[PDB]
Design a binder for this molecule. Structure first.
Ligand SMILES: OC[C@@H]1O[C@@H](OC[C@@H]2O[C@@H](OC[C@@H]3O[C@@H](OC[C@@H]4O[C@@H](OC[C@@H]5O[C@@H](OC[C@@H]6O[C@@H](OC[C@@H]7O[C@@H](OC[C@@H]8O[C@@H](O)[C@H](O)[C@H]8O)[C@H](O)[C@H]7O)[C@H](O)[C@H]6O)[C@H](O)[C@H]5O)[C@H](O)[C@H]4O)[C@H](O)[C@H]3O)[C@H](O)[C@H]2O)[C@H](O)[C@H]1O
Length: 596
């Protein structure tokens, strides 16, 4: 009855459901399918060309886009760069043969941090092969003629699709503000055209939101029929002050060179909210990708967080205060004495997500790529279920989706000790690990934090710590370390902080110290040539202190002193005294140290 998982490495996944089957489409022409959001099979060949699984002859097909960026050019020297797509079924799209209905993949191509463009391709079948249509949004264009190093491409704006639009009367003409004084692209205020996301709204209209760092995230209204932007055509401001551009659209997030990418927007027909997901930080293992969360009553904004702050920054400022941090770097550390093996389950730089909102059950899933502790830049896809908390915010489940659903939750299954992770607001390469609290039968919270708690209705959690209230739900989770299903909670404060709870198994101190003793292993102590690592700490704050029988062979801290060449091997005995509260255990380790 244990869950089975089959993983795949798709960067920047973007989920879509097609009948019985779930599909995700990532960067680098990578894509996979699942029937259960747990077992994925990849079906693509990547950047292979031709016979490219998605695009066929990659270079000739998408050449309309590669005239501008993303092929053997600058940062895509000797390769391609096809980034962060989105895929959906457009029942309204008029084909080349007059019939209506097609799959659309909206993709990015890029060659610098600013020179890039969004284009799209259509197809009879969702697995491809897709067939180019147009290139609709450019960035990194210049006021006069110019070139990037190791690039032959004239960057002047007259090389984009802008002149054609000025002809068709869709734009007045070039906006001066797009350029600095030196005539270069003004990405302080204007976007980098990648990461398109396609969403329908409440009345069934189509929209594309897009962008990464630089000037921010923009949204454009989309002609359901052709697949092309209905450009604003005139500059202006939104009623609340947000920039509207004639070409780029409406600014809904970010700005002033700060991070933010992987836009995904969903209309919730029940809460009547548009939820904006965005990822902060830098994608690699030392860059700290966060996922951030905002909402608006309009698809155009203004999008705000649980604190009621704008996703659009006021200037070059720390962006970390803004947006619900719904997931950062974390590790449910498997300390000495915890069941299972390994370091525990953790993520490094999770993010660039899509969302699937099921029409039948109303269950919501978060879908993202992530790296892992101790694994460098290796990454896999992960799915976490989201549940709607009492304030109209989806709250993310602590663990990957394993078939769980909301249930009636009984108080006696909630009471106990919890490992708790508080994702906070700051972010870095720091991995956040658990503290130890308990939810007591008297509805107080004691341990590494102090406060009160309430179950409300079938499963609503309310957690109060030091005058902050975190609202979310109690829900059952798969803990892959102890290999059991566990009680868990996730809750969100109106500071936009998320806290996670995973319930430890019930144990008394006398049981903890004996679990610690049985787990405490120094490895092979028979042929010792290096220093030994002696853990001073076991699970649930158990102190482990050490003594040695002979400091000349090995110290209290595990530093060994090998005999000089041509000596007899030497031995000492290390004693671990293990104490949790009033309990005590002892374990002895016999050490043999080899001479040089
Ligand atoms: O073999 C069978 C199967 O294979 C196995 O599969 C495993 C495979 O491995 C995966 O590869 C995935 C890896 O990740 C890919 O990377 C992801 C893609 O690229 C991403 O690029 C995004 C970039 O990120 C952002 O950078 C952020 C930011 O933007 C720029 O900012 C700098 C810039 O400079 C400033 O100047 C301003 C000055 O300031 C003012 O004072 C002055 O006036 C101005 O002059 C400017 O303002 C600043 O913005 C910088 O880039 C950075 O700072 C940026 O948005 C993007 O450029 C993209 O998001 C993502 O898609 C990596 O390439 C790939 O290797 C495969 O997927 C997987 O299949 C499997 O195991 C086997 O079965």
């Amino acid at each position: 009855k244990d869950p089975q998982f089959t993983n795949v490495s798709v960067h920047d996944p973007s989920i879509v459901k097609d009948g019985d089957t779930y599909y995700i489409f990532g960067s680098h022409i990578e894509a996979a399918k699942s029937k259960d959001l747990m077992n994925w099979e990849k079906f693509t060949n990547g950047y292979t060309t031709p016979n490219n699984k998605l695009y066929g002859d990659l270079s000739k097909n998408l050449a309309g886009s590669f005239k501008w960026a993303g092929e053997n050019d600058a940062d895509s020297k000797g390769g391609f760069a096809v980034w962060a797509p989105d895929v959906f079924w457009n029942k309204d799209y008029v084909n080349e043969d007059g019939t209506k209905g097609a799959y659309m993949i909206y993709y990015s191509v890029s060659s610098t941090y600013i020179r890039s463009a969004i284009g799209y391709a259509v197809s009879k079948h969702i697995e491809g092969p897709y067939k180019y249509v147009d290139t609709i949004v450019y960035s990194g264009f210049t006021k006069e003629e110019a070139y990037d190093a190791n690039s032959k491409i004239n960057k002047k704006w007259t090389n984009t699709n802008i002149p054609k639009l000025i002809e068709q009367g869709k734009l007045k003409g070039v906006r001066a503000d797009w350029f600095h004084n030196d005539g270069s692209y003004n990405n302080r205020d204007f976007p980098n055209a990648i990461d398109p996301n396609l969403f329908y709204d409440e009345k069934g209209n189509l929209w594309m939101a897009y962008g990464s760092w630089s000037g921010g995230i923009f949204v454009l209204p989309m002609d359901k029929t052709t697949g092309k932007p209905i450009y604003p055509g005139k500059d202006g401001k939104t009623p609340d002050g947000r920039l509207v551009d004639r070409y780029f659209g409406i600014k809904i997030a970010g700005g002033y060179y700060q991070s933010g990418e992987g836009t995904y927007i969903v209309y919730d027909k029940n809460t009547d909210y548009y939820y904006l997901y965005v990822t902060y930080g830098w994608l690699g293992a030392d860059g700290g990708y966060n996922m951030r969360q905002f909402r608006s009553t309009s698809p155009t904004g203004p999008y705000v967080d649980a604190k009621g702050q704008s996703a659009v920054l006021p200037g070059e400022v720390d962006n970390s205060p803004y947006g619900n941090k719904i997931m950062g770097n974390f590790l449910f550390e498997r300390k000495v004495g915890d069941p299972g093996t390994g370091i525990g389950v953790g993520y490094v730089s999770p993010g660039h997500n899509s969302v699937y909102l099921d029409r039948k059950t109303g269950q919501q899933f978060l879908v993202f790529h992530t790296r892992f502790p101790q694994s460098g830049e290796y990454h896999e896809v992960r799915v976490h279920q989201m549940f709607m908390n009492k304030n109209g915010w989806p709250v993310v489940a602590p663990y990957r989706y394993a078939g769980e659903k909301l249930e009636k939750v009984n108080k006696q299954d909630v009471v106990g000790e919890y490992q708790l992770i508080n994702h906070g607001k700051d972010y870095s390469a720091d991995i956040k690990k658990q503290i130890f609290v308990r939810l007591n039968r008297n509805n107080t919270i004691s341990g590494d934090a102090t406060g009160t708690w309430r179950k409300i209705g079938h499963n609503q959690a309310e957690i109060t710590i030091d005058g902050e209230t975190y609202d979310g739900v109690f829900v059952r989770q798969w803990d892959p370390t102890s290999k059991r299903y566990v009680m868990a909670f996730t809750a969100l404060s109106n500071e936009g902080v998320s806290i996670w709870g995973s319930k430890l198994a019930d144990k008394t101190d006398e049981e903890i110290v004996e679990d610690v003793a049985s787990d405490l292993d120094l490895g092979d102590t028979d042929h010792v040539v290096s220093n030994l690592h002696l853990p001073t700490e076991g699970t649930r704050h158990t102190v482990i202190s050490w003594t040695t029988s002979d400091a000349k062979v090995v110290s209290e801290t595990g530093v060994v002193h090998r005999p000089e060449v041509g000596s007899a091997p030497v031995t000492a005995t290390l004693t671990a005294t293990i104490t949790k509260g009033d309990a005590t255990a002892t374990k002895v380790f016999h050490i043999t140290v080899l001479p040089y």
